[PDB]
Scaffold this active site. Structure first.
Site, PDB file in Angstrom:
ATOM      1  N   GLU B 102       1.003  -1.149   0.042  1.00 17.76           N
ATOM      2  CA  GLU B 102      -0.015   0.028  -0.005  1.00 17.76           C
ATOM      3  C   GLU B 102       0.862   1.235   0.047  1.00 17.76           C
ATOM      4  O   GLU B 102       2.161   1.138   0.464  1.00 17.76           O
ATOM      5  CB  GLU B 102      -0.987  -0.005   1.348  1.00 17.76           C
ATOM      6  CG  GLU B 102      -1.616  -1.408   1.488  1.00 17.76           C
ATOM      7  CD  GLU B 102      -2.669  -1.752   0.303  1.00 17.76           C
ATOM      8  OE1 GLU B 102      -2.931  -0.667  -0.521  1.00 17.76           O
ATOM      9  OE2 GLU B 102      -2.849  -2.968   0.077  1.00 17.76           O
ATOM     10  N   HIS B 119      -6.614   1.838  14.612  1.00 14.03           N
ATOM     11  CA  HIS B 119      -7.360   0.707  14.527  1.00 14.03           C
ATOM     12  C   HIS B 119      -6.598  -0.687  14.815  1.00 14.03           C
ATOM     13  O   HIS B 119      -7.024  -1.167  15.740  1.00 14.03           O
ATOM     14  CB  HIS B 119      -8.025   0.622  13.054  1.00 14.03           C
ATOM     15  CG  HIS B 119      -8.852  -0.477  12.984  1.00 14.03           C
ATOM     16  ND1 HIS B 119     -10.070  -0.232  12.507  1.00 14.03           N
ATOM     17  CD2 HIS B 119      -8.666  -1.891  12.993  1.00 14.03           C
ATOM     18  CE1 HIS B 119     -10.668  -1.450  12.515  1.00 14.03           C
ATOM     19  NE2 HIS B 119     -10.011  -2.474  12.902  1.00 14.03           N
ATOM     20  N   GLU B 120      -5.804  -0.855  14.302  1.00 12.79           N
ATOM     21  CA  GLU B 120      -5.008  -2.388  14.510  1.00 12.79           C
ATOM     22  C   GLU B 120      -4.472  -2.223  16.123  1.00 12.79           C
ATOM     23  O   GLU B 120      -4.683  -3.458  16.621  1.00 12.79           O
ATOM     24  CB  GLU B 120      -3.808  -2.292  13.464  1.00 12.79           C
ATOM     25  CG  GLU B 120      -4.258  -2.706  12.286  1.00 12.79           C
ATOM     26  CD  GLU B 120      -2.773  -3.015  11.460  1.00 12.79           C
ATOM     27  OE1 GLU B 120      -2.540  -4.146  11.367  1.00 12.79           O
ATOM     28  OE2 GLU B 120      -2.466  -1.923  10.750  1.00 12.79           O
ATOM     29  N   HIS B 123      -7.171  -3.601  18.511  1.00  9.96           N
ATOM     30  CA  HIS B 123      -6.963  -5.164  18.513  1.00  9.96           C
ATOM     31  C   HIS B 123      -6.113  -5.742  19.264  1.00  9.96           C
ATOM     32  O   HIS B 123      -6.268  -6.574  20.204  1.00  9.96           O
ATOM     33  CB  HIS B 123      -6.824  -5.809  17.054  1.00  9.96           C
ATOM     34  CG  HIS B 123      -8.032  -5.534  16.161  1.00  9.96           C
ATOM     35  ND1 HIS B 123      -9.066  -6.006  16.332  1.00  9.96           N
ATOM     36  CD2 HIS B 123      -7.857  -5.001  14.918  1.00  9.96           C
ATOM     37  CE1 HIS B 123     -10.117  -5.579  15.207  1.00  9.96           C
ATOM     38  NE2 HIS B 123      -9.163  -5.033  14.361  1.00  9.96           N
ATOM     39  N   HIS B 129     -13.998  -5.869  15.738  1.00 11.53           N
ATOM     40  CA  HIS B 129     -14.723  -4.698  14.786  1.00 11.53           C
ATOM     41  C   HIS B 129     -15.957  -4.266  15.531  1.00 11.53           C
ATOM     42  O   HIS B 129     -16.823  -4.923  16.083  1.00 11.53           O
ATOM     43  CB  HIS B 129     -14.720  -5.342  13.505  1.00 11.53           C
ATOM     44  CG  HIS B 129     -13.381  -5.488  12.757  1.00 11.53           C
ATOM     45  ND1 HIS B 129     -12.479  -4.870  13.083  1.00 11.53           N
ATOM     46  CD2 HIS B 129     -13.149  -6.433  11.900  1.00 11.53           C
ATOM     47  CE1 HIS B 129     -11.458  -5.175  12.402  1.00 11.53           C
ATOM     48  NE2 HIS B 129     -11.555  -6.256  11.735  1.00 11.53           N
TER      49      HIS B 129
END
Lengths: 126, 168
Positions: B102, B119-120, B123, B129
Protein backbone atom coordinates in the site's frame (compact mmCIF):
# COMPACT_ATOMS: atom_id res chain seq x y z
CA UNK A 1 -8.38 -5.89 10.45
CA UNK A 2 -8.90 -2.66 8.61
CA UNK A 3 -9.41 -2.20 4.93
CA UNK A 4 -10.58 -0.30 1.91
CA UNK A 5 -13.28 -2.29 0.14
CA UNK A 6 -13.17 -2.78 -3.61
CA UNK A 7 -15.41 -1.19 -6.17
CA UNK A 8 -17.72 -3.95 -7.53
CA UNK A 9 -15.78 -4.01 -10.80
CA UNK A 10 -12.44 -4.54 -9.08
CA UNK A 11 -14.24 -7.11 -6.92
CA UNK A 12 -15.22 -8.93 -10.11
CA UNK A 13 -11.91 -8.75 -11.94
CA UNK A 14 -9.53 -9.70 -9.13
CA UNK A 15 -11.70 -12.43 -7.67
CA UNK A 16 -11.44 -16.03 -8.79
CA UNK A 17 -15.12 -16.87 -8.42
CA UNK A 18 -18.18 -14.65 -8.41
CA UNK A 19 -20.82 -16.95 -7.12
CA UNK A 20 -24.36 -16.31 -5.92
CA UNK A 21 -25.41 -18.35 -2.88
CA UNK A 22 -27.21 -18.66 0.44
CA UNK A 23 -25.64 -19.11 3.87
CA UNK A 24 -26.75 -22.50 5.13
CA UNK A 25 -24.77 -22.85 8.34
CA UNK A 26 -23.12 -21.00 11.20
CA UNK A 27 -19.28 -20.79 11.30
CA UNK A 28 -17.33 -23.86 12.33
CA UNK A 29 -13.60 -24.59 12.49
CA UNK A 30 -13.00 -27.31 9.88
CA UNK A 31 -9.59 -29.03 9.68
CA UNK A 32 -7.68 -25.92 10.70
CA UNK A 33 -7.85 -23.54 13.68
CA UNK A 34 -6.87 -20.70 11.36
CA UNK A 35 -9.98 -20.59 9.20
CA UNK A 36 -13.67 -20.83 9.94
CA UNK A 37 -16.03 -21.98 7.22
CA UNK A 38 -19.64 -21.42 6.28
CA UNK A 39 -21.69 -24.08 4.48
CA UNK A 40 -23.23 -22.38 1.45
CA UNK A 41 -25.83 -23.25 -1.20
CA UNK A 42 -24.59 -22.01 -4.57
CA UNK A 43 -27.28 -20.88 -7.00
CA UNK A 44 -25.85 -18.80 -9.84
CA UNK A 45 -22.14 -18.59 -10.77
CA UNK A 46 -21.11 -15.45 -12.68
CA UNK A 47 -17.38 -16.22 -12.77
CA UNK A 48 -14.84 -18.98 -12.20
CA UNK A 49 -15.91 -21.61 -14.71
CA UNK A 50 -12.34 -22.93 -14.41
CA UNK A 51 -13.65 -24.54 -11.20
CA UNK A 52 -17.11 -25.78 -12.28
CA UNK A 53 -19.50 -25.51 -9.43
CA UNK A 54 -22.68 -26.00 -11.25
CA UNK A 55 -25.04 -25.95 -8.24
CA UNK A 56 -23.13 -27.88 -5.53
CA UNK A 57 -19.37 -28.22 -5.99
CA UNK A 58 -18.55 -25.19 -3.92
CA UNK A 59 -20.33 -25.91 -0.66
CA UNK A 60 -18.05 -24.02 1.70
CA UNK A 61 -16.69 -20.50 1.91
CA UNK A 62 -13.66 -20.04 4.08
CA UNK A 63 -12.48 -16.98 5.99
CA UNK A 64 -10.00 -16.39 8.86
CA UNK A 65 -10.80 -17.60 12.34
CA UNK A 66 -11.04 -14.23 13.99
CA UNK A 67 -12.36 -10.83 12.89
CA UNK A 68 -9.22 -9.01 14.09
CA UNK A 69 -7.30 -10.93 11.45
CA UNK A 70 -9.91 -10.35 8.72
CA UNK A 71 -12.52 -13.06 9.26
CA UNK A 72 -15.89 -12.28 7.64
CA UNK A 73 -18.97 -12.10 9.87
CA UNK A 74 -22.40 -13.04 8.49
CA UNK A 75 -25.62 -12.27 10.45
CA UNK A 76 -28.88 -12.53 8.48
CA UNK A 77 -32.30 -13.74 9.68
CA UNK A 78 -33.60 -15.48 6.53
CA UNK A 79 -31.41 -18.32 5.28
CA UNK A 80 -32.96 -18.47 1.79
CA UNK A 81 -31.68 -14.96 1.18
CA UNK A 82 -29.19 -14.63 -1.66
CA UNK A 83 -25.75 -13.01 -1.65
CA UNK A 84 -23.09 -12.01 -4.19
CA UNK A 85 -19.78 -13.37 -2.95
CA UNK A 86 -16.69 -12.42 -4.91
CA UNK A 87 -13.81 -14.52 -3.66
CA UNK A 88 -10.37 -15.99 -4.27
CA UNK A 89 -9.33 -19.62 -4.49
CA UNK A 90 -6.59 -20.74 -2.10
CA UNK A 91 -6.00 -24.35 -3.14
CA UNK A 92 -9.43 -25.21 -4.56
CA UNK A 93 -11.27 -23.41 -1.77
CA UNK A 94 -13.24 -20.17 -1.90
CA UNK A 95 -11.96 -17.63 0.58
CA UNK A 96 -13.60 -14.49 1.80
CA UNK A 97 -12.42 -11.72 4.18
CA UNK A 98 -13.72 -8.55 5.85
CA UNK A 99 -13.17 -6.65 2.63
CA UNK A 100 -14.45 -9.26 0.21
CA UNK A 101 -17.43 -7.89 -1.67
CA UNK A 102 -20.40 -9.60 -0.09
CA UNK A 103 -23.79 -8.02 -0.32
CA UNK A 104 -27.29 -9.43 -0.65
CA UNK A 105 -28.28 -9.72 -4.32
CA UNK A 106 -31.53 -7.94 -3.61
CA UNK A 107 -29.84 -4.85 -2.32
CA UNK A 108 -27.85 -4.58 -5.54
CA UNK A 109 -28.76 -1.90 -8.03
CA UNK A 110 -29.96 -3.00 -11.48
CA UNK A 111 -26.75 -1.51 -12.82
CA UNK A 112 -24.51 -3.51 -10.48
CA UNK A 113 -26.48 -6.66 -11.34
CA UNK A 114 -25.93 -5.95 -15.04
CA UNK A 115 -22.25 -5.33 -14.39
CA UNK A 116 -21.81 -8.61 -12.59
CA UNK A 117 -23.77 -10.49 -15.23
CA UNK A 118 -22.21 -8.91 -18.32
CA UNK A 119 -20.20 -5.64 -18.27
CA UNK A 120 -17.43 -5.82 -15.61
CA UNK A 121 -15.37 -8.37 -17.58
CA UNK A 122 -15.10 -5.79 -20.33
CA UNK A 123 -13.00 -3.59 -18.08
CA UNK A 124 -10.78 -6.21 -16.41
CA UNK A 125 -7.73 -6.80 -18.64
CA UNK A 126 -7.04 -3.12 -19.37
CA UNK B 1 -8.65 -18.25 24.26
CA UNK B 2 -10.56 -21.55 23.94
CA UNK B 3 -8.83 -22.70 20.76
CA UNK B 4 -6.65 -19.96 19.31
CA UNK B 5 -4.06 -18.42 21.67
CA UNK B 6 -4.73 -15.05 23.24
CA UNK B 7 -6.32 -13.32 26.25
CA UNK B 8 -9.27 -10.86 26.54
CA UNK B 9 -7.13 -8.10 28.04
CA UNK B 10 -3.55 -7.38 29.03
CA UNK B 11 -3.00 -8.19 32.71
CA UNK B 12 -0.86 -5.09 33.13
CA UNK B 13 -1.26 -1.38 32.41
CA UNK B 14 2.22 -0.49 31.29
CA UNK B 15 2.74 -1.91 27.83
CA UNK B 16 5.85 -1.87 25.68
CA UNK B 17 6.02 -1.90 21.87
CA UNK B 18 8.56 -1.96 19.01
CA UNK B 19 8.56 -0.79 15.39
CA UNK B 20 10.50 -3.73 14.00
CA UNK B 21 11.24 -2.46 10.48
CA UNK B 22 10.36 0.50 8.27
CA UNK B 23 8.46 1.19 5.09
CA UNK B 24 10.35 2.98 2.29
CA UNK B 25 7.10 4.77 1.41
CA UNK B 26 7.72 7.12 4.34
CA UNK B 27 10.72 8.69 6.16
CA UNK B 28 11.56 6.69 9.27
CA UNK B 29 10.87 9.72 11.47
CA UNK B 30 7.34 10.02 10.04
CA UNK B 31 6.50 6.40 10.86
CA UNK B 32 7.41 7.07 14.48
CA UNK B 33 5.03 10.05 14.42
CA UNK B 34 2.12 8.06 13.01
CA UNK B 35 2.55 5.07 15.29
CA UNK B 36 3.07 7.15 18.42
CA UNK B 37 0.23 9.53 17.70
CA UNK B 38 -1.75 6.32 17.13
CA UNK B 39 -0.99 4.84 20.49
CA UNK B 40 -1.71 8.10 22.29
CA UNK B 41 -5.30 7.95 21.05
CA UNK B 42 -5.90 5.03 23.44
CA UNK B 43 -3.75 6.32 26.35
CA UNK B 44 -5.91 9.41 26.69
CA UNK B 45 -9.02 7.29 27.30
CA UNK B 46 -7.44 4.77 29.69
CA UNK B 47 -4.73 4.43 32.36
CA UNK B 48 -2.55 2.63 29.85
CA UNK B 49 1.05 3.59 29.15
CA UNK B 50 3.28 2.82 26.17
CA UNK B 51 7.06 2.62 26.25
CA UNK B 52 8.98 2.34 23.00
CA UNK B 53 11.78 -0.21 22.72
CA UNK B 54 14.49 -0.91 20.14
CA UNK B 55 15.71 -4.35 21.09
CA UNK B 56 14.24 -7.47 22.60
CA UNK B 57 10.61 -8.56 22.43
CA UNK B 58 8.03 -5.90 23.21
CA UNK B 59 4.36 -6.72 23.69
CA UNK B 60 3.28 -5.04 20.48
CA UNK B 61 5.61 -5.87 17.61
CA UNK B 62 4.76 -3.44 14.83
CA UNK B 63 6.08 -4.25 11.35
CA UNK B 64 5.72 -3.89 7.58
CA UNK B 65 5.53 -6.85 5.24
CA UNK B 66 4.38 -7.98 1.81
CA UNK B 67 2.69 -11.20 0.73
CA UNK B 68 4.15 -14.05 2.82
CA UNK B 69 5.54 -12.77 6.13
CA UNK B 70 5.71 -15.46 8.84
CA UNK B 71 2.18 -15.82 10.23
CA UNK B 72 -0.62 -17.83 8.59
CA UNK B 73 -2.19 -14.81 6.91
CA UNK B 74 -0.24 -13.52 3.86
CA UNK B 75 -1.07 -10.08 2.62
CA UNK B 76 -3.02 -9.62 -0.61
CA UNK B 77 -0.74 -7.31 -2.55
CA UNK B 78 -1.88 -3.74 -3.34
CA UNK B 79 -5.37 -2.84 -2.23
CA UNK B 80 -8.07 -4.72 -0.31
CA UNK B 81 -6.54 -5.78 3.04
CA UNK B 82 -4.25 -3.03 4.27
CA UNK B 83 -3.29 -4.53 7.63
CA UNK B 84 -4.04 -7.00 10.40
CA UNK B 85 -3.39 -7.44 14.11
CA UNK B 86 -3.53 -9.89 16.98
CA UNK B 87 -5.29 -9.88 20.33
CA UNK B 88 -3.56 -9.53 23.72
CA UNK B 89 -1.36 -12.43 24.75
CA UNK B 90 2.07 -14.11 24.58
CA UNK B 91 4.36 -14.08 21.55
CA UNK B 92 2.83 -12.91 18.26
CA UNK B 93 -0.16 -11.63 20.19
CA UNK B 94 -0.75 -7.91 20.34
CA UNK B 95 1.43 -7.55 17.28
CA UNK B 96 0.38 -5.51 14.28
CA UNK B 97 1.49 -6.02 10.69
CA UNK B 98 1.12 -3.62 7.77
CA UNK B 99 0.79 -4.17 4.00
CA UNK B 100 3.79 -2.41 2.40
CA UNK B 101 2.24 -2.86 -1.05
CA UNK B 102 0.00 0.00 0.00
CA UNK B 103 0.96 3.65 -0.34
CA UNK B 104 1.60 4.74 3.21
CA UNK B 105 1.20 8.47 3.85
CA UNK B 106 1.21 10.78 6.84
CA UNK B 107 -1.34 12.96 5.09
CA UNK B 108 -4.71 12.79 3.31
CA UNK B 109 -3.14 11.55 0.06
CA UNK B 110 -2.85 7.81 0.46
CA UNK B 111 -3.50 5.26 3.16
CA UNK B 112 -2.99 7.14 6.44
CA UNK B 113 -0.66 5.05 8.57
CA UNK B 114 -1.96 6.73 11.72
CA UNK B 115 -5.58 5.88 11.03
CA UNK B 116 -4.76 2.26 10.38
CA UNK B 117 -2.33 1.86 13.28
CA UNK B 118 -4.91 3.37 15.63
CA UNK B 119 -7.38 0.75 14.45
CA UNK B 120 -4.95 -2.15 14.63
CA UNK B 121 -3.70 -1.19 18.10
CA UNK B 122 -7.32 -1.41 19.28
CA UNK B 123 -7.05 -5.14 18.44
CA UNK B 124 -3.73 -5.52 20.25
CA UNK B 125 -5.52 -4.17 23.31
CA UNK B 126 -8.51 -6.49 23.01
CA UNK B 127 -11.08 -4.70 20.86
CA UNK B 128 -13.18 -6.21 18.06
CA UNK B 129 -14.71 -4.83 14.88
CA UNK B 130 -17.57 -2.38 15.29
CA UNK B 131 -20.73 -2.10 13.22
CA UNK B 132 -20.97 1.62 13.97
CA UNK B 133 -19.60 3.16 10.77
CA UNK B 134 -18.51 6.21 12.75
CA UNK B 135 -16.45 4.05 15.09
CA UNK B 136 -12.69 3.82 14.49
CA UNK B 137 -12.97 0.08 15.07
CA UNK B 138 -15.08 -0.14 11.87
CA UNK B 139 -12.81 -2.15 9.52
CA UNK B 140 -13.61 -0.30 6.29
CA UNK B 141 -11.04 2.48 5.85
CA UNK B 142 -13.14 5.65 5.64
CA UNK B 143 -10.33 8.23 5.15
CA UNK B 144 -11.21 11.64 6.59
CA UNK B 145 -10.18 14.98 5.08
CA UNK B 146 -8.66 17.23 7.75
CA UNK B 147 -6.64 15.01 10.10
CA UNK B 148 -6.51 17.68 12.85
CA UNK B 149 -10.15 17.11 13.81
CA UNK B 150 -9.89 13.33 14.22
CA UNK B 151 -12.08 12.08 17.07
CA UNK B 152 -12.82 8.75 18.74
CA UNK B 153 -16.36 7.42 18.60
CA UNK B 154 -18.04 7.31 21.99
CA UNK B 155 -18.54 3.64 21.21
CA UNK B 156 -14.78 2.98 21.12
CA UNK B 157 -14.39 4.82 24.40
CA UNK B 158 -17.12 2.78 26.07
CA UNK B 159 -15.45 -0.23 24.45
CA UNK B 160 -11.87 0.24 25.59
CA UNK B 161 -12.82 1.54 29.02
CA UNK B 162 -15.13 -1.44 29.74
CA UNK B 163 -11.85 -3.35 29.67
CA UNK B 164 -9.11 -1.09 31.06
CA UNK B 165 -11.19 1.52 32.91
CA UNK B 166 -10.92 5.31 32.36
CA UNK B 167 -7.87 7.38 33.30
CA UNK B 168 -7.35 7.94 37.06
Amino acid sequence: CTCVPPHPQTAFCNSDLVIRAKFVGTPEVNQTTLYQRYEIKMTKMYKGFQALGDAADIRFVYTPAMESVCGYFHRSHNRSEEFLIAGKLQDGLLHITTCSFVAPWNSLSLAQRRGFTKTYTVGCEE
Amino acid sequence: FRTFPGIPKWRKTHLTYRIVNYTPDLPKDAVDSAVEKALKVWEEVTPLTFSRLYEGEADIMISFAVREHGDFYPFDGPGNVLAHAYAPGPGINGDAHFDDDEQWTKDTTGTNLFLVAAHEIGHSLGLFHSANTEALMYPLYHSLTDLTRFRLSQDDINGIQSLYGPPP
